[PDB]
Amino acid sequence: GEWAYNPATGKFVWTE
C-alpha cells in the first residue's frame, strides 16, 4: 500500500 513504513518506530511493515 501507500503506507509500508512506520515512522513512529523506524520499522518497515513487512507484514503488508
DSSP structural state of residue 16: -
Query: Please, which residues have CB within 8 angstroms of residue 4's CB and are 6 or more apart in sequence?
Result: 12, 13, 16
Locate 5 and state its grid cell.
Answer: 513504513
- Which residue's C-alpha cell is 512506520? 6
- Technique behind the model: NMR
- Which residue's C-alpha cell is 513487512? 14
Locate 8 and state its grid cell.
Answer: 513512529
DSSP string, 1-16: ----EETTTTEE-TT-
